[PDB]
Amino acid sequence: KTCENLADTYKGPCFTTGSCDDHCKNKEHLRSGRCRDDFRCWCTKNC
């Protein structure tokens, strides 16, 4: 029951999920962040 959208202010590949995770929480103000195989960050959010 969670939604997951692209981190918009995240330009670049995910080299460390921790960084991406941090980004989705701080910058996107969401729940967490998970990196895709395509290296882009999809931020898991609550809905």
CA gap 37, 20 in Å, rounded: 13
Residue 20: how many CB atoms within 10 A of its CB?
25
CA gap 41, 13 in Å, rounded: 8
CA gap 1, 10 in Å, rounded: 24
Spatial neighbors of 22 by CB under 8 A, at least 6 apart, are: 33
Query: What was the structure determination method?
Result: NMR
CA gap 13, 47 in Å, rounded: 26
